[PDB]
């Protein structure tokens with residue numbers, strides 16, 4: 001019966017418990033910038049960042065056949081100079097220890113244009129596989145989400161997000177909420193970890209600006225997470 | 232900095248920590264029946280039950296001006312012999328210590344046809360003030376909800392529900408989920424406790440069958456809850 | 463799998479979640495006075511107070527045979543005008559719902575000079591059954607402790623106390639610590655709840671001044687507690 | 694306000710969240726062997742192991758001046774073929790990220806015969822600086838403990854240990870308990886982290902067999918730990 005939890009209400013520059021990738025960095029202001037931006041703070045096209053959590057997570061044990069439940073929360077934001085021309089998006093995810101980045105822009109640095117990753121996307125941009133309108137999605141080893149739901153996204157406003165995975169029912173659930181606007185979104189579906197990730201994994205976020213365009217920055221303010229893996 | 236939490240995965244007949252009201256009782260089977268039903272288990276019109284939690288909850292302190300945050304979860308179900316003719320509904324709520332029941336049927340035993348109660352309704356029945364289709368609602372000292380959202384309800388299937396109240400932003404958030412169906416609903420809005428309940432309160436559920444008709448039973452399987460009231 | 467927890471860092475006058483008995487009251491200053499004292503704050507002989515916690519605790523279930531584990535912490539103090547002439551003591555305890563007080567002075571209001579109570583005593587006074595020097599003791603249905611250990615008590619100084627009961631090993635453990643003095647005491651022994659209390663109980667403290675003399679007041683500053691009762 | 698916690702009831706061979714050093718390894722049997730032993734399981738003189746926890750711990754922040762509180766628990770054991778001739782001991786500790794081992798035998802791999810380490814020792818062996826009889830000690834940047842207390846140690850029997858550090862009072866407290874024997878030991882003292890470790894640290898255990906002799910193996914069965922570092 002293994003557990004773990006952590007939580008921060010700010011990010012400390014150069015925390016040794018974290019791992020930055022791509023343009024992803026930790027402002028002194030405490031924010032987690034994953035995207036590169038102008039002196040003017042303008043997001044910079046073809047930008048890319050990821051950020052993982054040092055300790056790896058024992059998602060599930062093969063001996064016991066046990067699968068864990070975890071939940072994670074965090075508040076992110078996005079800045080976008082032209083709310084008409086948006087992209088590319090943000091994700092939270094579970095990968096394996098060795099995970100380096102991947103395709104930028106529409107692949108949210110998670111998938112490859114070509115080719116054991118699970119995640120929740122906050123997609124700003126209508127790709128070919130994307131449905132209409134910024135949505136939220138569950139990605140199971142694929143940028144084409146198993147299920148989606150509009151995301152009543154809102155520029156510059158903060159959003160609290162909560163993600164849960166119930167081993168018992170095998171149900172990832174994600175809800176995003178915008179206190180500023182008193183609006184809210186939720187999504188749910190089954191996901192079989194036992195067959196989509198390694199007995200151990202590392203979690204983190206990923207985020208991408210557009211190619212042709214800047215789109216929107218993506219900074220994360222806080223993160224908490226916990227897991228129980230039963231005997 | 233006051234806190235409290237409890238949680239049960241079943242109900243024990245005659246738990247001294249609880250309080251039954253109306254037809255509300257605790258089956259040996261461990262369920263929390265709030266409605267009276269046939270030998271055949273058929274809900275029985277004009278039925279009514281409530282069930283409160285012994286210890287009262289210090290929702291907020293006037294000296295300090297502090298307001299608490301709490302969250303509560305629980306899984307309920309409903310049985311309805313004629314999925315066409317449904318009613319009347321279920322609620323979870325915060326009232327003051329002395330709260331006895333009130334109007335039955337459409338008033339979900341919470342309000343009076345006439346006349347400091349806050350709650351979340353899972354309304355099966357279209358009253359006059361009700362919108363169309365079973366919804367979910369936030370009730371603030373009134374059976375006419377401040378905001379609502381369809382409830383993709385489903386007979387006989389179990390639903391996990393989670394309710395949160397963030398003092399900081401003053402935002403009650405409710406999400407109901409039906410793992411069986413992989414569907415999900417969420418609702419959010421601000422609620423000022425400081426002006427809608429007493430420094431201390433008691434929480435519990437309430438549930439009602441129809442007048443003219445039976446409608447649907449309402450049993451609750453589990454309950455967990457916690458609160459922090461800061462210094 | 464039933465749980466419960468609460469914690470306060472101060473006492474609120476007239477908390478509806480608590481129960482006072484005897485002279486036990488809640489100063490505005492936030493302290494929990496269990497003993498009556500002078501305008502000068504001088505403890506008043508033959509004084510007596512208890513204070514219980516509203517919600518009852520399901521210590522153990524007969525159907526399942528399950529026994530719970532709990533731990534409790536709290537910081538108390540004692541004021542004693544004549545550190546030479548001390549008494550009578552303080553206790554923390556588990557009794558059954560209906561528990562009213564009992565013998566004063568040396569019986570710490572827990573036992574009767576004559577005659578299902580479990581507790582930990584912080585004895586200031588050498589009774590006949592008492593060993594030498596203020597000690598700490600485990601009382602199992604009897605003022606004559608099953609085991610004891612000196613208590614390097616210290617007037618007017620605050621003491622943090624922690625009590626644990628491990629169902630698995632059936633071991634109550636108590637440790638008292640005096641940060642002020644960087645000193646510390648610990649005691650341990652087995653206790654069979656299953657045969658010394660009711661499936662349900664209520665917990666609280668009890669405290670007594672001397673007969674012939676005042677001895678020492680006993681106020682409690684904070685209290686936290688938790689319990690898991692497994693399936 | 695940063696926190697973290699983890700806990701395991703067994704050790705998984707080759708957990709990527711841990712770090713072995715010296716002879717320290719993880720038996721398949723789930724135990725954490727820190728010492729090398731015979732095919733017969735006989736401890737092997739001049740043996741040495743340490744084991745650290747992957748994620749580093751932000752013990753305290755210089756900007757804020759904040760210091761954290763943590764507590765840790767774990768159950769260890771020791772096997773010793775000749776209960777007359779014992780050594781060398783075991784420790785739990787906080788060091789800085791880069792910590793590799795150090796002096797063996799009496800230095801419990803923590804200190805150097807010569808020369809920012811804080812720890813609690815379970816010393817089997819009377820060095821020169823050691824007091825009489827296996828004790829427990831608080832080591833602050835030195836194998837000569839700031840304070841000690843006998844350890845009513847017991848061969849082959851399991852011991853539950855609990856360590857707490859209260860930032861507020863700056864008091865490390867350690868209590869060791871032997872349910873098997875219903876005995877118990879406790880130690881307490883102030884320790885200024887702010888001046889004895891780095892803003893960030895890594896924790897783990899260390900353990901040593903004797904030089905001339907085998908003494909006693911040292912395996913650890915379980916570990917839990919948590920920390921809050923306030924804003």
Ligand SMILES: *[C@@H]1O[C@H](CO)[C@@H](O)[C@H](O)[C@H]1NC(C)=O
Pocket residue numbers: 008009010075158159160179221222400
């Ligand atoms: C999200 O977290 C940030 C940083 O911890 C905080 O300043 C902000 O107000 C938070 N927003 C919500 C909605 O909790």
Ligand SMILES: *[C@@H]1O[C@H](CO)[C@@H](O)[C@H](O)[C@H]1NC(C)=O
Pocket residue numbers: 169239240241306389390391410452453
């Ligand atoms: C809800 O709780 C009940 C009783 O604790 C349990 O048997 C049922 O499977 C639960 N359903 C979900 C979706 O967790």
Ligand SMILES: *[C@@H]1O[C@H](CO)[C@@H](O)[C@H](O)[C@H]1NC(C)=O
Pocket residue numbers: 470471472537620621622641683684862
């Ligand atoms: C004990 O609790 C009181 C009241 O909460 C506090 O003011 C006091 O400083 C505490 N002492 C210790 C040693 O924690």
Ligand SMILES: *[C@@H]1O[C@H](CO)[C@@H](O)[C@H](O)[C@H]1NC(C)=O
Pocket residue numbers: 631701702703768851852853872914915
């Ligand atoms: C200590 O932990 C081990 C492994 O988790 C367990 O098997 C053993 O019985 C425990 N002993 C105590 C006293 O809790």
Ligand SMILES: [Ca+2]
Pocket residue numbers: 088089106123124125126127130
């Ligand atoms: Ca896209």
Ligand SMILES: [Ca+2]
Pocket residue numbers: 319320337354355356357358361
């Ligand atoms: Ca209605």
Ligand SMILES: [Ca+2]
Pocket residue numbers: 550551568585586587588589592
């Ligand atoms: Ca006595």
Ligand SMILES: [Ca+2]
Pocket residue numbers: 781782799816817818819820823
């Ligand atoms: Ca030594």
Ligand SMILES: [Mn+2]
Pocket residue numbers: 121123129130131137143144145
């Ligand atoms: Mn998509």
Ligand SMILES: [Mn+2]
Pocket residue numbers: 352354360361362368374375376
């Ligand atoms: Mn309604």
Ligand SMILES: [Mn+2]
Pocket residue numbers: 583585591592593599605606607
């Ligand atoms: Mn005694």
Ligand SMILES: [Mn+2]
Pocket residue numbers: 814816822823824830836837838
């Ligand atoms: Mn020593």
